[PDB]
Design a protein around this nucleic acid. Sequence first.
DNA 1: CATTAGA
DNA 2: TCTAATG
Length: 327
Amino acid sequence: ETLNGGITDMLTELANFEKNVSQAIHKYNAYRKAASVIAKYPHKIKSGAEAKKLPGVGTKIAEKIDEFLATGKLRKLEKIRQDDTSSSINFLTRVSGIGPSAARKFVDEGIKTLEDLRKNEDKLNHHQRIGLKYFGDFEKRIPREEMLQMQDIVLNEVKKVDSEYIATVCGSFRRGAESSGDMDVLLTHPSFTSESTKQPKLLHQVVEQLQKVHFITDTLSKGETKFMGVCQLPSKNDEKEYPHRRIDIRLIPKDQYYCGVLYFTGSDIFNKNMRAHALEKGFTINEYTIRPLGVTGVAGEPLPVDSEKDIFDYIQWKYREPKDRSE
DNA sequence: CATTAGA
DNA sequence: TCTAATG
Ligand code: NA
Ligand code: NA
Ligand SMILES: [Zn+2]
Ligand SMILES: [Zn+2]
Ligand SMILES: [Zn+2]
């Protein structure tokens, strides 16, 4: 956690680089498991050979481990870090919609900068166009203060549209968080569950309302259950317009709402921990349900959930407010 | 690990 | 159809 820190950090840098700059899923996979185990190792690694005894650590990494222990650096790391091509890919990739694949491509053609991106907006698809457009605004955290206004809006419209809608804003924001990255709204409705062969309109009506009053300003991807756009609080009385925010809305079969809400609310750690617990308690938890375990090794039969409670009850835990879902 | 664009 | 990108 701090004993194997640089080691695991160097390893991750290395890993990540294989994967993006080059396309060596293998090495890239190498560094990762390695970085994974040395991370667990409960002792201060004092040398390569010592490391080496680890599962996943072979001679290559061992060597890196030595150089790094020996001199506080690494050559390949120094080299990479400097490498303009690689720097370039790492950067382009920051545009929402630009992944490694495309990043490499552009570079190839020679678009290495944000400005390059501009004169070449033609080479870019819709998503990427929007990502380019709100590059600054997207990089910005969302102050909770704003979160409350946004939530405020979405709730009112949702409701005006149909009163049968149930929406919950998940994420860190749900957990108390001072700021958040984007708004996640989980939605479900009664007339829509596991069976009841869809009802696309259900998601669409709402998106439509939202855009209607100018909350949603762009569509990154809209399908029949997941809408991915951009929103913005009305830039009030001039002098201060708001930053364009990322928003995601998902439609859920009402019969698997709370599992989902449970899930998305996190945190990753509360999850895993909540999940690990369900197991002893003789169950299984996932993004959509909770099924009792059966001795034959496994089992199914999706238990009926009416609120975040029932799930707790099931695994017979203490209801933990979202606020304290931290781990 | 699942959903959407796109070519 | 696959393969990318977001989560
Ligand atoms: Na080994
Ligand atoms: Na990106
Ligand atoms: Zn020790
Ligand atoms: Zn989020
Ligand atoms: Zn999100």
